[PDB]
Design a protein around this ligand. Structure first.
Ligand SMILES: C[S@@+](CC[C@H](N)C(=O)[O-])C[C@H]1O[C@@H](n2cnc3c(N)ncnc32)[C@H](O)[C@@H]1O
Length: 252
């Protein structure tokens, strides 16, 4: 208990200070990015993983995890907003292909991908459009993220077929044409949206759900059990030096 709980509380306090500073002045982004790198290195260190796993508290552990995953999700968003505003303020124009996340279920230019939680700095959305030539829809509930994302796409990828909207999945007119769906990891509602998508989507749709379980759940929303007759987990992609893992879902 004692050891890992103390560090996790200290990270929560550090994230509070860094996040509050960045809200007042975006010059403190570099310090927050460094904290996020240190946090990542902590999460992926087998020593801390073992300590975390050994802490068999139920209530306090669960709550502390939930406090961290919420504030660090806000930090991820704030980094994206600042990076986006910097690119647009200028008015000027890596290690893994997103296609890799779908294993055998490959993406061609004839396919159509929905990315849930596109974000203000939608590099992943642009990446997959450029790599695959597929049509791409990104949704984000935050209109700041919709505006920044839309205008970044128009600068960096004007020739790709990319739509960004605040529409919920039940409001997407072309939902039945979607062949591939990716969920960003830092979406609290991702499993409720997954369940809603069952009835909305065609029968052969494939979903890549990004998540973090165990110690990775302090920087990600975790996996959940799905309704067993609806979404079947056909593949789990878990790696020790990846800050998020991927669960592939198909119908029945
Ligand atoms: C950090 S950002 C961008 C994606 C991020 N890079 C990731 O991979 O987790 C996460 C985005 O998801 C958005 N978001 C959160 N909940 C959502 C929901 N229920 N539906 C759509 N977008 C959501 C946030 O507004 C935010 O812009």
């Amino acid at each position: 208990n004692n050891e890992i709980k103390l560090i996790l509380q200290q990270y929560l306090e550090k994230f509070e200070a860094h996040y509050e500073r960045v809200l007042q002045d975006d010059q403190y982004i570099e310090a927050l990015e460094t904290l996020m790198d240190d946090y990542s290195e902590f999460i992926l260190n087998p020593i801390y993983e073992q300590q975390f796993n050994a802490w068999r508290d139920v209530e306090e552990k669960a709550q502390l995890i939930k406090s961290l995953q919420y504030i660090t999700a806000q930090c991820v968003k704030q980094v994206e907003v600042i990076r986006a505003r910097r690119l647009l303020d200028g008015q000027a124009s890596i290690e893994h292909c997103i296609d890799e996340e779908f294993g055998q279920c490959s993406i061609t230019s004839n396919d159509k991908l929905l990315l849930v939680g596109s974000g203000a700095y939608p590099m992943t959305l642009i990446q997959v459009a450029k790599e695959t030539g597929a049509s791409v829809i990104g949704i984000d509930i935050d209109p700041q993220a919709v505006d920044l994302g839309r205008r970044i796409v128009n600068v960096l990828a004007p020739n790709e077929d990319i739509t960004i909207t605040d529409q919920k999945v039940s409001e997407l007119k072309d939902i039945k044409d979607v062949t591939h769906i990716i969920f960003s990891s830092t979406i609290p509602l991702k499993y409720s949206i997954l369940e809603e998508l069952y009835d909305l989507t065609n029968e052969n749709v494939v979903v890549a759900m990004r998540f973090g379980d165990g110690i990775k759940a302090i920087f990600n929303y975790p996996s959940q059990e799905t309704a067993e007759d609806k979404w079947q987990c056909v593949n789990k992609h878990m790696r020790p030096q990846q800050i998020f893992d991927i669960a592939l879902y198909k119908k029945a």
